[PDB]
DNA sequence: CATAATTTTCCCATTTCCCCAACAAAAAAG
DNA sequence: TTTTTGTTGGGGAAATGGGAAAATTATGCT
């Protein structure tokens, strides 16, 4: 089913079958594959794509732009992003029902329940399903998008100690490629949220460790949003610890960035937090 | 050659061949493929990966962690970025020589020559080759990483109007998704640099267009670096156009962000620019 | 207009892959 | 023994590679 869009891509680049053919694939097989008549192995498909100067990510994206993007987990988080952004609780809660067309696996149900916990405190993930998701994450080899998102939304639902331990493992086991730092950016955001939660719990050794780790992640990475929330994180850290004038200075500076960059909502939430810190 | 790392992945998630076996692929074929004995079509490999909760990029990244990467345009820009950061002019220029173990295609040579132009004014791409790369980009269908990087690194070498036209075409033809917001970030950076060059040439209608377009790209995209350079861009815009009191404030706000976070050198570049503008 | 280019596609040699079974084989059920 | 998993063959089915028609485009010149 892929070959059709290979034809589309090839003709858009005004390249002939004769050109993309090489010692690795005969012209006839390209003709057949592009016509949905036969299927070629992934290795040779990558070879042909490289001839055309297009990534497999780019090609599969163009191919999913036509046809359909079926139940993936990528489309699941996409859908939850759209609903949560709109604040449609009864649209997300429906993913747990029987009649749902998006199907959730146990860990997916745990993650959705934990996301719904922020929209409604009454929606609580069971102690057992949470310990099962922790069981899974503790026995991971290399962390992909899947495991990252699973941990990321349950940072405040699973036991703290478990959360920090899993964060430490994630930092030194997740899949990363320089040409796509999406996983890296999400990991940095998760680490910073774990840092905020660590200052909440007053475990300053975990705080120091995560501050160094986040520093490393941020280094020569133009993720100024993460840098800003991390500046506020270091401020919260130094305030909880000693009530440092440099910490409150950093916390003020972060809201100042959120002001210059007209990010109204971020500035507002990080102002209301600072208010509770200075009121009490 | 792929199957081996699939085995690794499968063994890391501690799931059996019987588990990933389904209506689409027999167990024996998985055994053989993982043993480097037979090859499955990309569709079936995608299916097996989907069962294992891993992207095809994630999987190919793990596969490239071992073995070796056939040096491509992706790895070429990887290398040139690393060298440019370190300021190794002769290490970049060596890519054009006989002795280079990267064989650069004509447009790749044009891009490298243009990268060397910023490091040395004497290195200028010929009038012919720049028009050759422009001709290529003008007859592109969908803009992938290749075409985007080619334009982005030649924004100041090809004809201004040609560059702006190619930018306008790129904004409405590039490949974009969600599991990879990389290309969108690069496109936003390119648009903002085209905006700076548009204020340089004083084509304020092009500026207006790019301001709206960049606005659209940035919306609820936490690219505070792009937002900062765009705030300074709008400041330069309003200053050159009207000598606006609001524009100098915007430029000051952007330099303020670059200081507040602590990106020293960015602060230096955008300070030297503001200094020359307020001096003259 | 007609003819001459390329791009493409249609059939058939053989190689290779693949589902169905039977085994081979370590576990973690009893 | 009790579900389980990793690795083998054999009829069958595809997927390939190499040649010629047929659809599509570029031009033959008076």
From TrEMBL, chains A, B:
Transmembrane segments: none annotated. InterPro entries: Cro/C1-type_HTH, HTH-type_regulator_Rgg, Lambda_DNA-bd_dom_sf, TPR-like_helical_dom_sf, Transcription_activator_Rgg_C. GO terms for molecular function: DNA binding. Pfam families: Rgg_C. Residues 24-59 form the HTH cro/C1-type domain. Gene3D superfamilies: Tetratricopeptide repeat domain (1.25.40.10). This is Positive transcriptional regulator MutR family. It comes from Streptococcus thermophilus (strain ATCC BAA-250 / LMG 18311).
């Amino acid at each position: 089913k892929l070959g059709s869009t290979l034809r589309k891509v090839r003709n858009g680049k005004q390249i002939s079958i004769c050109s993309v053919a090489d010692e690795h694939l005969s012209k006839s097989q390209i003709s057949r594959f592009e016509r949905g008549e036969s299927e070629i192995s992934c290795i040779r498909l990558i070879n042909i794509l490289d001839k055309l100067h297009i990534t497999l990510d780019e090609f599969l994206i163009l191919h999913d732009e036509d046809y359909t993007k079926t139940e993936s987990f990528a489309n699941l988080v996409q859908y939850i992003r759209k609903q949560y952004s709109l604040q449609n609780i009864n649209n997300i809660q429906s993913l747990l029902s029987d009649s749902s067309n998006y199907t959730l696996d146990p860990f997916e149900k745990t993650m959705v329940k934990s996301i719904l916990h922020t929209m409604d405190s009454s929606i609580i993930p069971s102690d057992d399903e949470l310990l099962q998701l922790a069981d899974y994450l503790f026995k991971v080899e290399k962390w992909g998008y899947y495991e990252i998102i699973l941990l990321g939304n349950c940072v405040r639902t699973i036991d703290y100690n478990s959360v920090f331990l899993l964060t430490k493992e994630m930092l030194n086991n997740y899949i990363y490629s320089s040409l796509n730092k999406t996983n890296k950016r999400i990991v940095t955001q998760l680490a910073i949220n774990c840092l905020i939660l660590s200052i909440d719990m007053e475990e300053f050794t975990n705080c120091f460790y995560l501050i160094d780790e986040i520093k490393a992640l941020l280094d020569n990475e133009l993720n100024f949003y993460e840098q800003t929330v991390f500046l506020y994180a270091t401020g919260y850290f130094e305030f909880k610890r000693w009530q440092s004038t440099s910490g409150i200075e950093k916390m003020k500076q972060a809201i100042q960035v959120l002001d210059i960059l007209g990010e109204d909502n971020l500035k507002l939430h990080y102002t209301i937090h600072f208010d509770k810190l200075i009121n009490n």
